[PDB]
Each structure stands twice: as structure tokens, then as C-alpha cells.
Design a protein around this ligand. Structure first.
Ligand SMILES: NC(=O)c1ccc[n+]([C@@H]2O[C@H](COP(=O)([O-])OP(=O)(O)OC[C@H]3O[C@@H](n4cnc5c(N)ncnc54)[C@H](O)[C@@H]3O)[C@@H](O)[C@H]2O)c1
Ligand SMILES: NC(=O)c1ccc[n+]([C@@H]2O[C@H](COP(=O)([O-])OP(=O)(O)OC[C@H]3O[C@@H](n4cnc5c(N)ncnc54)[C@H](O)[C@@H]3O)[C@@H](O)[C@H]2O)c1
Ligand SMILES: NC(=O)c1ccc[n+]([C@@H]2O[C@H](COP(=O)([O-])OP(=O)(O)OC[C@H]3O[C@@H](n4cnc5c(N)ncnc54)[C@H](O)[C@@H]3O)[C@@H](O)[C@H]2O)c1
Ligand SMILES: NC(=O)c1ccc[n+]([C@@H]2O[C@H](COP(=O)([O-])OP(=O)(O)OC[C@H]3O[C@@H](n4cnc5c(N)ncnc54)[C@H](O)[C@@H]3O)[C@@H](O)[C@H]2O)c1
Ligand SMILES: Oc1c(F)c(F)c(F)c(F)c1F
Ligand SMILES: Oc1c(F)c(F)c(F)c(F)c1F
Ligand SMILES: Oc1c(F)c(F)c(F)c(F)c1F
Ligand SMILES: Oc1c(F)c(F)c(F)c(F)c1F
Ligand code: NA
Ligand code: NA
Ligand code: NA
Ligand code: NA
Lengths: 252, 252, 252, 252
């Protein structure tokens, strides 16, 4: 009921955090368009959830995104919320091991893909007085070791969220972001598998939070539903979903 | 349904933001104890809302607060959430017009009252894996003119929220705060009435937000219900409910 | 030369960070009044440093502070900078082990002592277009375990710094703060000595910073001299002197 | 004397903030390499300042930057500090008026140019235990209207500064940034000239700060010299040089 009659697009919604956000919006009564560059997870999610449908779309391809928006409007008649979740964290890379071209590529996904869908969706969000939710990262705010390009892309997303919030406020379109800390997802598991001791890597990630565990996609999803449906006086905020990782002293 | 079977105490719940928080929790299915030093608003709210009851309590009086907690447990058998909302903003005061004793008095209400109820409630919150929500202010983070004591008390509340979150995390008790900006309440109206041109004061307060309006108690209430019921990986966060007042350049 | 002809008051200047700030200002060419409630360290510093003199003053005693200001003006004819450094970190205390009265006492030293000297000094700082520097703490911003009252007092100091900066900006008086992280001082050493394994406590404190060491009083002192003498467009800022402790993930 | 015997590279040092930073480091005793894509200002500065020399270099051209570093080492034998100041603020642009390609171009200058010089300089900074200073912007932290691409690039710079600080801390290389607010420069003047009422635009920019004026390049320069020469326990910090623009409520 909380978001009934509304239409939501979630990028990277085929697995991980994006899938948890898809589920949370379906559970709120919304119709959800799952956007993903990979077919496997998103196609299964459409079969599983009445009210969710899957559209293949690579957010780095401008024409893919144009088609995502026009098909969303053609099939559902309105657009109320865009969740820019698609993005990627590379394996650990020392600064001297990064490249300008790798940096540009990560910018294309983590930042410009968010920019392009938001831009194409804003005319419809203005009609609906809808809202934008960007999935950034805690490490955009506090930094991270061996991740100069990734951290830079999320710093940009969080800052862009505030600029856009200023620009769209006279039209009643809110723009917010969520900064998750360690969330247990296939990406986290993939990255842990590259480590010498994956179980040690995972235990270390759990202990980075005062709460002693990592977060869940469903917890990010509930934050997104709050921002969309109940946060009518929130715009340009950075909602931390981190288990307290930013608090207090730790072993650095 | 979202917070059914839960018991919530809201201090200063007789009017303004506190009353909006009371209403939001009742609408979520919780039973609510309205604490206030004034009888008029809170007594009427109890008559109006099934599931809410009023207990007279001045949060600066330690024995009042002891009785608030013990009566809450006696009457409802559990305690899941404490919302420390009671507090006051004095009229504008130049720094040379403040006094150490006025500062101590405002500290007693805005900070130590929050500290005392939280302390007395924590043994019951640990049993329920409940949570604490402190109502701070945006001006604790960014400052405000002619309000040195007030700003200082809210800086302390926001910082204390993070310290307590660290201490209580091994027990599964989350501690968060909400920082509202300009919310249209009887306090805001009272303060505007002291100005030479109250309508000019109010128009200026509306235009301090990119959204062009002040916030509502119900919007603070929805943020509080989110933190209590759906933010299980959030602890020690400062949730801004400000309409974007902190964003961008303005006339300073 | 950088602060020649200027007169600076440093509270708690008899040892630790305060003594490092005294030394830095003397080395810059300023005359320095060392305020401390203890005679031993401050008296020796006056004998050691030409241009520094010691005045016994407990910043929690309003009449002590009145005399500190009037004696500073009587002896040196002007007042350009007040460094509010006096303050104390109690031993670790679980929240249920704190008291309202202990909290009030720490507020008297860490917050109201800073407030009282600043208030009495502002008429002279206005004449000189001088400035105020408050020594807060990183843990006011990010929290700390087993330190609810301390963290709250430094949250208040940092917020008060911004409020005062707003109030005094039309008079050209800047108000800034420094937030040190772990600085190796007699206080740090005293607190480490209370731990079961003091050498383990100290090694843990060094490793809380990416730089792998604690900071020095002289490094806080150089930050203070910068704010006083060269930061003419800085007001209301929080200058972090923390070795990066706030950056990245750590063992929490 | 404060930075005697040291070698500093300042990008965009031919005018504006960069020229003020060049002057501040020369006045501190350092030798300075002025990098700029434009010959006019930087060539004159070399003639004016003994100890400063001009090297033509476009920071978006990787081979220009390779030559800048190798010529700095060839001519001066060491490299102690890199100030990444080159960058540009476009005219106001509504979000629907921006393009992905314009965004990529601004990223090339404001972000990747900083990344490329830092990367090529780090082997020499490690030898000297030198430091990096990035010139970001206050609007990366708080947002700005009609500047989505610009704000995003400075959000990235500030975040990248913290990531790099973490990576380089075990080598004793500090990485910090300065976030100026409104600084009176040829860029500010150029942008004001595009407005309908340039004098009204400028008066509005002065009043955006509680101090009632814009900042000077020399004030940014003094902050940079502090970070390089005296801030040995500061790494990953964001030093605000804004006149208090971020403080308090304003007309938004
Ligand atoms: N996992 C964490 O701890 C964590 C923490 C903070 C932020 N984040 C952010 O959350 C988001 C999701 O992370 P995750 O852990 O769920 O990752 P994930 O790898 O598990 O899932 C990402 C999904 O996005 C899709 N995707 C990738 N590139 C795409 C593209 N070009 N177009 C469309 N879809 C694309 C993938 O196919 C996948 O289904 C990312 O923005 C990530 O940076 C994650
Ligand atoms: N109104 C705003 O714009 C605004 C903005 C930011 C923060 N806040 C904070 O929100 C809270 C509520 O503000 P409001 O505008 O609703 O104020 P309000 O004056 O309208 O309501 C406050 C309520 O608290 C009660 N109260 C006061 N002192 C008390 C005490 N000692 N014990 C018990 N109850 C007591 C009052 O009787 C009243 O019912 C305060 O903490 C305030 O600082 C308000
Ligand atoms: N040491 C750290 O790691 C650290 C970190 C962050 C902030 N701080 C802050 O720095 C300041 C100094 O800390 P420190 O480690 O140098 O402490 P310290 O105990 O070594 O020195 C404090 C000095 O202040 C004096 N003092 C105490 N109470 C006083 C009073 N009422 N009136 C006058 N003088 C008084 C003491 O006699 C002593 O000379 C404090 O405000 C502290 O909170 C310290
Ligand atoms: N002026 C302000 O209010 C303000 C505020 C915050 C941040 N900043 C930042 O400060 C920096 C300098 O700003 P400014 O106002 O002095 O600008 P400016 O235009 O006056 O000076 C910039 C200088 O950089 C040079 N430059 C530009 N592109 C270059 C390139 N590709 N390679 C080499 N040199 C290049 C220009 O030729 C010029 O000499 C920028 O990073 C800007 O974003 C400025
Ligand atoms: O933002 C991320 C992210 F995407 C990940 F996949 C991580 F493992 C992590 F630690 C982060 F901070
Ligand atoms: O925190 C407050 C508050 F309580 C008020 F009543 C206000 F009017 C205001 F502007 C604030 F920022
Ligand atoms: O602020 C402080 C302080 F004063 C101390 F003495 C400490 F040991 C510490 F860790 C802090 F964060
Ligand atoms: O960062 C900048 C900048 F570069 C400019 F040129 C400006 F005019 C301004 F307002 C900013 F915030
Ligand atoms: Na379906
Ligand atoms: Na009732
Ligand atoms: Na002396
Ligand atoms: Na020269």
C-alpha cells in the first residue's frame, strides 16, 4: 500500500542490492521495471514477482537507456522513481596499478550511467512529482584503501545527488542517495574469493561494523522505499546504511 | 502493522513535532506513552488516539523520569523505542546577552533530559533489542545566528547519539538521531510572533529551504517510524529532515 | 614574525597540547599568557620562555576568568587570540556507569569554561579583530566507545564554534576549532596507565591512525598558529589533526 | 624559510588561485614550477619571481604531464609537493542542458588531470616524503545550482583525496585537499560578466559568506603552504577556505 499505483525503475536489479530494492518496492505495492545488462537474474525475478518486469539494458549505452525509459512509459503510463543502483567495485588496486582508461571506464558505469538515466527520466518524474535515489557508497565519504577510482566515482555520485536536488527542487522532484557500507552481495562474495583467505576477508568485513555483521539487500531496499514514499521533506540527503562503520576509532 | 506489538515513549509528545511522532507510531500499530510537562495537549491526544496514553513527566526531573519508565513497564510490559523529543529553542540571543546559568538550564532540558531517560530505559531496550531516537537539529551541524546555547546543546545531542550507538551495538540496541530543519510547529509560531514582522519572519523561514516550504511534524514522524521499524542496519546516523536547507549557497 | 606584536591566551597551557600551543605562538613572535589551574607546569614554562607569563586560573571559576582577562589587558594592552584548550577526558565509563552529576561537571570544564572565557574576551577581540580557537576532539564528530559525557561535550564545542562564528563575523572576529585525534600527552599516558596492558593500549592507539603514530602537541600548535595568523578567510571551520583516523574501514 | 630547499609544482599556476599559491610557496623559500596550458600569465610570473619557472603543460595531455615531471626532476633534482589546481567551472547549465560528452570533458580536466600528475609524481614524492594538495571546491560537499557536472567532478576530487591518503600513508606521503568557496579570480569575473547584471551577481557572491566578502588567492595560497610545510599529522583532510559560506541558514 505505501507506494501503490507507482512505477519504479531499478538499474542493476537482477541480483544483490538491486534485487533487494526491487523486492522492497514490489512489497510496497509498486510496479517495478528491473533493468540489468545480464539476463539471468533479472529474468528469473520477473517470473517470480507479479508486478515486476525485466528489461535488458546496459546503462553505459545511451540508446539502451533511451529505450528503457520509453518502454517503461509505453507499458505503464507513468514513472515515479528511478533507483540508480547499477555499478561495480573492481578488485583491490594500488594507485600505481590503476590506469586513466580503467578510471574512465568505471566512471562510465558508476557515474555517467546514473547521470544518463536520470536525465532521460526527469521529464516524466516532473509530471509525477517523483524522485531519484542514487546508490553511492560510504567509501565515497570516508575513503577506502586500494580503490582510488571506485572511491572517486562514489564521491561524484554523492555530490551530484546534491546538485541535482538543488536544480529539481522548484519542480518538486526530490533527489537523494543511500550510502551502504559492507552489504553481503554476490559482488562482496566475488571480491572475497579473490583474497588469499576468503573466510578471513569476510570475517574482517563483518567486524568493520560495530553491529558485528554485514548488511542485507533488504535493508538497503527498505531505506529506498522510505526515501521514495515517506520522505517528502528530504532532498539531497545521504542516507547511511552502514551498521555504524564510520563511528569511532578502529585499526587503520 | 509495521510496528505492531511494540511500545514507544515520546517525550514532549503533547504538541508540535512530538505529537506528529506520537501519531505516526500509533498509525504504525504501536502503543505510545505520551510524556509532557504540560497537561493540555497530551491529555487531549490520549482521548483522541486509542493506543496512546498520557503521563505527566518533566524530563529535567530525575524522579519524574524514573516514574515514566516504571509506569510504562507496569502498564504495557515492555519498552521498544524511546524518542527524546522534549526540548526548547530560546528567542534570539546575542552572545553577550547569554548567561552561563541560562546555558546550564538549556543543557538540562535539551541534553541531560535526553541522557536521563535513555539511561533509565536502556535495561528494558536491551531486553527487547529496541532502539533510541534523539531529535537534534540541523543547526547543531551547521550552526545558527543568535543561538549559541541552543546550537551547543544540539551539537552535544548528535555527538552523544554516536557515542551511545557504539556502546550499545554489542547488545543490539540501535541509537540514531533526526536533525530537522525548519518545521512548522507552535514553537516556530511563538518565535515568529516575537519578531517585528512575524509574517516576514515566516516567509524568510520558508525560503531557507530549496523546497520553498517548512516541514511538517508528520514528516518528522515518518522518519522516526522508519528508524524504529525498518532501519535495522542503521545505528549512530543523523537523519536530515530539512528540505535541503544545508545545500548550496545562500544569503548569509 | 608571523604573529609578532600579538597577545594570546592559552588555557590549560601548562602541559600537553596546551604547552605545545604556547610554544608555537611564542616561536611565532607573540606574547602568551599561560592559564592553568595547576602551578607546576605553567610556572616552569614562564621561566623557560621569554614572552610567556603564567597566570593561575581555573576556567570553571567565573571570577578566575574575569581576572585572567583583566590582568592580560593590564599587563599587555591588547588581546588578539584566545585558545580554549583546558579540558579533560575521564577514564572509560560504560553508559550505565555515568551519572548526571559527573556529566554536568565535565560540561562545566569542557564546554562552559570555553564559553565563559570567550564571552569575557570578545569585547577585546572585537577591538583587535582577533580570533577564537577552540580545541575540540575528533570523537565529537565520529563518537567514541565508553565516553558518552566526553563525546557530548566536544560535540557541543564544535557546534558552538560555528554558532559563534556566525555571530561574530560582522565584527571581523573569526572563531574556529581544531579537532585532534590521538595526541601523545600526559593525559593519554595517564589513561593508558589505567589499562590492564598499558603498552598494548598505546600500540592500539598508534595503529588507530593510517600514519601509524600518534600526533604531537607541536603539530596541534602549528595548526593553531595557522588559524590565528594566516587563515583570514576561515571562520567556523573544524580543522582535523588526526593522522587520518577518520578515514576508511577499521576494526570496530 | 618555512619550505626552503623544497620543490613544488602548481598546475594552473598562471593566474587566479594557482598564481596565489605559486606566490605563497615562493615567499616560503620553495622553488616552484608553474604549469599552465596558457603561456601569457605563467611566463610573466616566471620573469617576476626568482625561484619560479614556467613549463607549458596541458594536464589533460598525458605526455605533457610526463614531460612536466621529468623536466622538474631534471632541472631541480627533487619533487616535494604537487598542487593540483588546474580546473574550470563552466557557465550555469540546467541539468537538461548538460551533455554526457561535456561531462566527460570536464572530468578529464578537473579529475583525471589531477589523477595523472599525482600518479606520475608519486615515485618522487615517496623519495622526499612529500605531499599532494588537491584544490577541490566547497560545492563538492554542499552542492550548487546549475552545475551538475562541475559539482560531480569536485565531489570526486575530495573523495579521491581520502582514498589516496589511505594508500600513501605507509610511505609517509600525505594527501590533502583545500575546498575554497567564492574566491575573487579571473574565472569568477568571467562568469559574472555572463550574467544579466554582473555587479548584482558579484554583490550576491560577496553576501554568500558571513564575512561579507569573497576570498583571495593569497588566502588559498597560505592554506596550501600550511598543508605542505606544517601539517605533518594531517592527511586526507578537506580544508575549508570559504568565509563561512556553509554555516547557518540562508536564502535558498
Ligand atoms: N556490496 C556492498 O557492500 C556495497 C557497498 C556500497 C555500495 N555498493 C553499491 O551498490 C550497488 C550494487 O552493488 P552490489 O554489491 O549489489 O553488486 P552486484 O555485483 O552484486 O550487483 C550489481 C548488478 O548490477 C548489474 N550491472 C552491472 N553493470 C551494469 C550495467 N552497465 N548496466 C546494467 N546493469 C549493470 C549486474 O549485472 C548486477 O546484476 C553498486 O552501485 C555498488 O557500488 C555496494
Ligand atoms: N520546530 C523546528 O523547526 C525544530 C527544528 C529542529 C529541531 N527541533 C526540535 O524538535 C523538538 C520539538 O520541537 P517543537 O518545535 O515541536 O517544539 P514545541 O514547543 O512545539 O513542542 C515541544 C513539546 O515539548 C514539551 N516539553 C518542553 N519541555 C519539556 C520538559 N522539560 N519535559 C517534558 N516535555 C517538555 C512542551 O510542553 C511541548 O509539548 C525540540 O527538541 C526542538 O529542539 C525543532
Ligand atoms: N590528548 C589527546 O589525544 C586529545 C585528543 C583530542 C582532544 N584533546 C583535547 O585537548 C585538550 C588538552 O588535552 P591534553 O591531552 O593536552 O590534556 P592534559 O591533561 O595533558 O593537559 C590539560 C591541561 O589543562 C589543565 N586544566 C585542566 N582543567 C583545567 C581547568 N579547570 N582550568 C585550567 N586549566 C585546566 C591541566 O592542569 C593541564 O595542564 C583537551 O581539551 C582535550 O579534550 C586531547
Ligand atoms: N574561483 C573560485 O571561487 C573557486 C572556488 C572553488 C574552487 N575553485 C577551483 O580553483 C581552481 C582555480 O580556479 P580559478 O578561479 O583560479 O580559475 P582561473 O580560470 O582564474 O585559473 C585557472 C588556471 O588554470 C589554467 N588551466 C585551465 N585548464 C588547464 C589545463 N588543462 N592544463 C593546465 N592549466 C590549465 C588556466 O589557464 C588558468 O591559468 C580550479 O580547480 C577551480 O575549480 C575556484
Ligand atoms: O562500496 C563498496 C562496495 F561496492 C563493495 F563491493 C565493497 F566490498 C565495499 F567494501 C564497498 F565499500
Ligand atoms: O532547531 C530549531 C528549532 F527548534 C526552532 F524552533 C527553529 F525555529 C529553528 F530554526 C531551528 F533550527
Ligand atoms: O579527545 C580525546 C582525548 F582527550 C583523549 F585523551 C584521548 F585519549 C582520546 F582518544 C581522545 F579522542
Ligand atoms: O568552485 C567554484 C568555482 F570554481 C567558481 F568559479 C565559482 F564561481 C564558484 F561559486 C564555485 F563554487
Ligand atoms: Na512479473
Ligand atoms: Na488513548
Ligand atoms: Na617568560
Ligand atoms: Na623566475
Amino acid at each position: 500500500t505505501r507506494y501503490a499505483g507507482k512505477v519504479v525503475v531499478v538499474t542493476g536489479g537482477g541480483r544483490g542490492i538491486g534485487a533487494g530494492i526491487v523486492r522492497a518496492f514490489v512489497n510496497s505495492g509498486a510496479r517495478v521495471v528491473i533493468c540489468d545488462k545480464d539476463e539471468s537474474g533479472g529474468r528469473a525475478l520477473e517470473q517470480e514477482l507479479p508486478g515486476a518486469v525485466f528489461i535488458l539494458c546496459d546503462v553505459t549505452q545511451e540508446d539502451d537507456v533511451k529505450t528503457l525509459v520509453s518502454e517503461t512509459i509505453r507499458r505503464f503510463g507513468r514513472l515515479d522513481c528511478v533507483v540508480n543502483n547499477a555499478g561495480h567495485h573492481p578488485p583491490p588496486q594500488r594507485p600505481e596499478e590503476t590506469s586513466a582508461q580503467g578510471f574512465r571506464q568505471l566512471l562510465e558505469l558508476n557515474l555517467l550511467g546514473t547521470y544518463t538515466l536520470t536525465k532521460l527520466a526527469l521529464p516524466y518524474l516532473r509530471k509525477s512529482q517523483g524522485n531519484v535515489i542514487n546508490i553511492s557508497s560510504l567509501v565515497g565519504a570516508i575513503g577506502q584503501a586500494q580503490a582510488v577510482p571506485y572511491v572517486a566515482t562514489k564521491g561524484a555520485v554523492t555530490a551530484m545527488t546534491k546538485a541535482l536536488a538543488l536544480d529539481e527542487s522548484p519542480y518538486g522532484v526530490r533527489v537523494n542517495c543511500i550510502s551502504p557500507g559492507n552489504i553481503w552481495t554476490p559482488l562482496w562474495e566475488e571480491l572475497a574469493a579473490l583474497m588469499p583467505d576468503p573466510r578471513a576477508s569476510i570475517r574482517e568485513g563483518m567486524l568493520a561494523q560495530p553491529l558485528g555483521r554485514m548488511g542485507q539487500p533488504a535493508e538497503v531496499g527498505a531505506a529506498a522505499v522510505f526515501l521514495a514514499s515517506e520522505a517528502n521533506f528530504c532532498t539531497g540527503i545521504e542516507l547511511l546504511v552502514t551498521g555504524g562503520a564510520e563511528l569511532g576509532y578502529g585499526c587503520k
